[PDB]
């Protein structure tokens, strides 16, 4: 006759996580590496998005 012994399944090989990096670099060098910095009363805030 024909008998069913066990069940077979394929196991995942490697786990992969990805979120979208998709963007531009980011305006940081112009802040930290800037040649000159603003005074403590004419305040320079740069927007980052």
């Amino acid at each position, epitope marked *: 006759g024909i008998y069913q012994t066990s069940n077979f399944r394929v196991q995942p090989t490697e786990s992969i996580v990805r979120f979208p990096n998709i963007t531009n670099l980011c305006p940081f060098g112009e802040v930290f590496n800037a040649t*000159r*910095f*603003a*005074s403590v009363y*004419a*305040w*320079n*805030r740069k927007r980052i998005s």
Partner: nanobody
Amino acid sequence: QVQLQESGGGLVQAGGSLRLSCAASGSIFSPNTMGWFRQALGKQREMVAVISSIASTQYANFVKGRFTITRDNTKNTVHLQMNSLIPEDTAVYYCYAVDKSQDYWGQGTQVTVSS
């Protein structure tokens, strides 16, 4: 990179007149607030006049009644009308632009009056 061009210095005898100027060629966020600073060799920076583009005068008492400044809103240029020069008031002058984002300084102009 907002750049200010300073010119109008030189050597003038006692009682003469000098015409300084600084121009703002940058983006200039919002209405700005022009200014000027006087620093003698070996002293701090003594501001002369920091008139806003609108009002408030803001004139120091060091040279009261002698120095006046004009505004040209067409090109946002600045001119200084210096009169009755005295050797005590001779020093290095720097144009100051407050702006909205950050404030800048000129390269320096030399004013020397003696007799």
